[model samples]
Target: LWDPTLPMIPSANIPGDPIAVVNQVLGISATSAQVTANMGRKFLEQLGILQPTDTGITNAPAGSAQGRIPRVYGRQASEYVIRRGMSQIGVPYSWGGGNAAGPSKGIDSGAGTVGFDASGLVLYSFAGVGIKLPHYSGSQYNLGRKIPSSQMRRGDVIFYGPNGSQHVTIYLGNGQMLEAPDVGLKVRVAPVRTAGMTPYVVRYIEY
Candidate 1:
């Protein structure tokens, strides 16, 4: 009679000692308590319906701003991307640095600079939120529906140029974006209208 797809699920539907029902149905006593809890949490996580509040995922400004940024949907997936980007605000710009394998050494400094570049940063940040993005500007760009500037909200992926490594940044709201600029620069939040361009934005709501 219970369903994982039901709203406000997990704890309520798959609460502590959930194996009781299974045990009753199976007419057996083989299910363990530890297994019950782990299975419950894992199942909900797989559905993207369980919001993990255990770790720190912050979306605040680089330091402290008026917090008057553009309003965005309260999607936990979006918040996950923003907060992940915020945490790596000072990491160096590295090419081929981060991927499914996590952070790796980049092209410059004889592979000395170890961190994420434009697309790498996006993949790394979204990984924690269970958002698996293709590590390319164009691919990531295609992941969601395109939105005009007026409808932009926090966590929107801002592509600097023609996509596919044309450069990508995470909108931090209030006319600012989180970027890993280039080889020399580290990741940081900058104005949406940086010196070089005024790129388009897209919203990823699939989460």
Candidate 2:
């Protein structure tokens, strides 16, 4: 059954600054100064701006121009998906938690948990960019364009298990992946796991 609670794909809108655009995509209320410096750099890097070595604002060089906002065209929805997912690091992982809007309670063993499962993370991540993906990993895998591993780039969804039925994680470019691991673990960045990955990755938005 179609669920009305899911977010609709956004209509064409005017481009805005990187920080504001990122905030809108992630559904976060924070202003530019409130975000992590690393996350900020990620947004600027997506716009081909200067790179920073600091993990966050705490360690950035004093008097640096990192605070200045940049004007640019908006990034692809794919990038927004990755950025939104990255922003969720440290959030707890719940078995059935996560919806189009954000984290929620889980079911079964995860009843008390309120966070994201593998595919739930995928769902919420894509949802930030207005792409509606099913909560089940397998169902979500069926909707995107398949990409050969040789050509895989950022924002590709990698799946495990037969026909992508078991688990899914989003590629974070530069050989890293973002995932909402099983219960007891939190959403985190890790080296791409490939022991049982599918032959081809899936891509929803063209870059």
Candidate 3:
């Protein structure tokens, strides 16, 4: 049976000043950060926004004015994110009850509930391919390239915060999205402009 509670695909969007995009894409993360930095120090020691002095491989600095966002992901990665994501529709939003496995336990909320907070939901969605996102909204924010609304593409992760990027959501095009909202709330599809605020979007789609 076709379930309405499944993550769907569509979309346009943005990322930058955003860290770890190319870093991770080439398969770099926490350990990579250390290894590269260690490798750099043991020789050139280049990491985030610097050059490498070693002979293995080098990823130059990607600052606020970084290069293009991937925008395009394999259908397997993007589609799985959406389909598996929305499948949890109606699942209660628990602060720490998710770990890229739909639902689990949390170190905070401890609701013994099922479902996600904001980032956990996305983390769960992308874990299938060994792609793991940061567990918090801010860290995740620092992982993609920034873009404007006119360029939003489906499955492009987005963020919101009147003062700072506090909330994150996934674009499903047609101006609708998959968001976990807040505590005591269930994950649901909402209009991109809900609450009358234009959020920041990070592009993972290739235009």
Candidate 4:
């Protein structure tokens, strides 16, 4: 049974960096720094701005440029989704861990093994807004009407995988994306491509 006395899980809306709150609540320790770094790393990972390394650090240089935001054609929901996903960078990848649609049909084991795989991140972010999404990459791409790559928008879901069609990610603009990637790594940002490595990009969100 659920414990009613448990403190409410904090939302991403906390001011002055969520990491500060985490550090204060968890006590002063190296863990706090690690947590802060992890949060940044996760956002970078999902944006596909860089690749994952064993050090839990990324090679993508940090910047404060506000113009780097992506170009969305329709509503800014995609941006909202990507931001929410980035905020939960340190969340563990649990199979069927966070699905608003009753547990039985949310995320599956194969996808979960990827460890915070693309679909999982998408699910977590959207769930906060009460949006139900399929658990795996393949199924996710098929949900909602498909939009052309030229019309991609913020919070739009992008896919990649075996033969450039198996895996999935969310477009975060500025030539970057947010994805779970694979096991042994958390969520991060990486480059967006549609040739050679990435064959096609399908936009799942309309405007």
Candidate 5:
């Protein structure tokens, strides 16, 4: 019998198609073939029995001064959050726009345009997983539990400026983040902005 909860097994050790293995163990054919790798790694990392390095899967920092940033564990809920955020890539950025349902029109300079500001994107993504976050970056920063910057995993919220007053973005693993960015920018993935990043990254979906 196969068990996802057990951390001793590696993906290589599993026989045949991972989809088949999952269906056999969980009695469901819901997961796709592509997610098998991430699903397996996330489970093992969460258990703490499998060190990320032990798998020989390390992401070298392309631009950061740091040598390598290890992929960290997050729950399925967190993965859903990242997926939701990523789906909006290329959508225009509108200051003060976006909500749980999706992008909306903004006010002032962003009026008559429909898209997402930084925190607005954050609101929409977490809403997909049933976590309601406030529209303002400052308020959203206050809601989640804080973790050290080094421990931040995919789906964690990284903020800029003092008390997250300036910007918010969803962390993707390997030193990248998803953000609605500025008025002229579209929702895009970019390198993590470590210069102004707060010491504590926020976590809504705990692993």
Candidate 6:
């Protein structure tokens, strides 16, 4: 009762071909929800979508002080430390903030109140070179042998104040010093020749 030799019909029809019938045997509409659902399932199967994994690679440690500051004295390391510390200039002043022999710790509040105090900046700079310094500026002043201003070098620590009220800074060169001044300002590079402050003490690390 059926034509056995009729050219094998394609499951999908050519739109303009005569005698071609759309293969919607189940009477489904192309734009119907059932078709959309089937399409979504097919898409998911074809793409092999998967759920995310819970585990991932952990973060590795980077080298300490790597590229943060340059190596060797007479370079910008002192300045870098000073400026880096200066960014948190307006932090509050703490009596014993930074490590006695380590870098200062805190935010920059302003000239000197917060972050690394004057002495803390000096300690941080030296700590970069593996030299540990005392916590307070007064005690730090007495660490190494005092050197005369004429003999001061790049990494040398310079102390100010009359006879009792001492402050410290790291000498860069050409009579300039890097210091965390006072509250309301950031750490900065200023002239050692500032009035009222005397270059009363100078100390150099042993090698």
**Candidate 6 per-residue C-alpha lDDT over 127-158 given as tens digits, one digit per residue, 9 for 90 to 100:** 43233444455555555556665677766677
Task: Score every model by TM-score.
Answer: 0.59, 0.64, 0.59, 0.49, 0.64, 0.46
Clashes of each: 1, 0, 32, 27, 0, 20
Off by over 4 Å in 5: 1-74
Question: What lDDT tens digits, residue by residue, belong to model 2 across residues 1-207?
Answer: 111221122111112211221345777653223333435455445556544553323221222322233313223546677888889999998876776556767767677988887887887776553354666776766776788866678888887766676677899788888988766889999887666677888876554
lDDT of candidate 4 over 69-152, digit per residue (tens): 223422443555566778756545443333322111113443434235455566555543223344555555554545566666
User: Candidate 5 lDDT, tens digit per residue, 91-193?
Assistant: 9998777765677777666778989888878877776544555567767777767778988888788977667767778999899999887767799999887
Model 4 alpha-carbon drift over 4 Å, by segment: 1-76, 90-115, 162-165, 195-205
**Between candidates 3 and 6, which one is better according to lDDT?**
3
RMSD, every candidate, angstroms: 16.7, 13.1, 11.4, 15.8, 16.7, 33.4
Cα lDDT computed for each candidate against the true fold: 0.53, 0.62, 0.53, 0.45, 0.64, 0.43
Best by lDDT: 5
Error of 4 at 101 (Å): 10
- Which one wins by lDDT: 4 or 5? 5
Candidate number with the higher TM-score (5 or 6): 5
Candidate 2 TM-score over all chains jointly: 0.64
lDDT of 3 by residue, 134-185 (tens): 5676566665556675677787777654321356688898899898766668
Off by over 4 Å in 6: 1-96, 100-114, 162-165, 194-200
| Worst 10-residue lDDT window, candidate 2 | 9-18
